[PDB]
Design a protein around this ligand. Structure first.
Ligand SMILES: C=C1/C(=C\C=C2/CCC[C@]3(C)[C@@H]([C@H](C)CCCC(O)c4nccs4)CC[C@@H]23)C[C@@H](O)C[C@@H]1O
Length: 253
């Protein structure tokens, strides 16, 4: 069976697309406002050197902080999100922030050279830039694998925004209060996605796609935990806080 999208489901999709268009600048025109990226010589991938300088951390921390603000804006436009208590809204945002960033970053990621290309050379982010920010391959490898995997799903923009919305409004987040309400909101989004794929996504892929998308949400949970471990190590580095931002300190602290 291929039920058609209800008027409400169409509205939800239009709302999410508009929300994404208002919060994701495909030209990356604000990036020059961030603290400048610095790339020091480290072909050897020296952890000692990387930690002593954390040359790319100020720039990436500003990028991530900027992105969190956008995700907050996006979340506030998700149908139903405002119905949640302020406390639940914050718990969901803090717990999914890094995951949504990884998801939305897929738009700038390119398999041409496996990098996130946001402009000229200065704003082309490679795995080497992540290491220069203090991270290890335990996070980087899975991250790239995840990016390529998501790219291959060839998601329609409609599927992309729904996946981000579903990621945010998850009832199984530590600390949530009204899980039932959150699940109700998420189910409404999941059904919309499931329905969209069935009557709008042409084969090969009319099916199987939903499961693959759900699996990516699971992958995101693992990356979230790995990033958390790495962030902890990073926080031990003296003077690290100055290379971050208040928003970032709260979200990952
Ligand atoms: C943000 C966005 C973009 C790219 C994403 C990237 C490339 C550079 C490195 C990133 C930011 C990965 C890096 C794992 C995160 C590590 C940094 C970090 O622990 C911290 N930082 C502040 C406090 S701790 C995750 C997503 C990757 C560009 C554009 O698509 C907008 C998108 O929101």
């Amino acid at each position: 069976l291929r039920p058609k999208l209800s008027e409400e489901q169409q509205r939800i999709i239009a709302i999410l697309l508009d929300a994404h268009h208002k919060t994701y600048d495909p030209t990356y025109s604000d990036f020059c406002q961030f603290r400048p990226p610095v790339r020091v010589n480290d072909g050897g991938g020296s952890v000692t050197l990387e930690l002593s300088q954390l040359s790319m951390l100020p720039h990436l921390a500003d990028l991530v902080s900027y992105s969190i603000q956008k995700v907050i804006g996006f979340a506030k436009m998700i149908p139903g999100f405002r119905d949640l208590t302020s406390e639940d809204q914050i718990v969901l945002l803090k717990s999914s922030a890094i995951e949504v960033i990884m998801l939305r970053s897929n738009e700038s990621f390119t398999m041409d050279d496996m990098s996130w290309t946001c402009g000229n050379q200065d704003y082309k982010y490679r795995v080497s830039d992540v290491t220069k920010a203090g991270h290890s391959l335990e996070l980087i490898e899975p991250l790239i694998k995840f990016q390529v995997g998501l790219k291959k799903l060839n998601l329609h923009e409609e599927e992309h925004v729904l996946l981000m919305a579903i990621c945010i409004v998850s009832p199984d987040r530590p600390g949530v209060q009204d899980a039932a309400l959150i699940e109700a909101i998420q189910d409404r989004l999941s059904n919309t996605l499931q329905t969209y794929i069935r009557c709008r996504h042409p084969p090969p892929g009319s099916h199987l796609l939903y499961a693959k998308m759900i699996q990516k949400l699971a992958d995101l949970r693992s990356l979230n935990e790995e990033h958390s471990k790495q962030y902890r190590c990073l926080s031990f580095q003296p003077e690290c806080s100055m290379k971050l931002t208040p928003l970032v300190l709260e979200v990952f602290g």
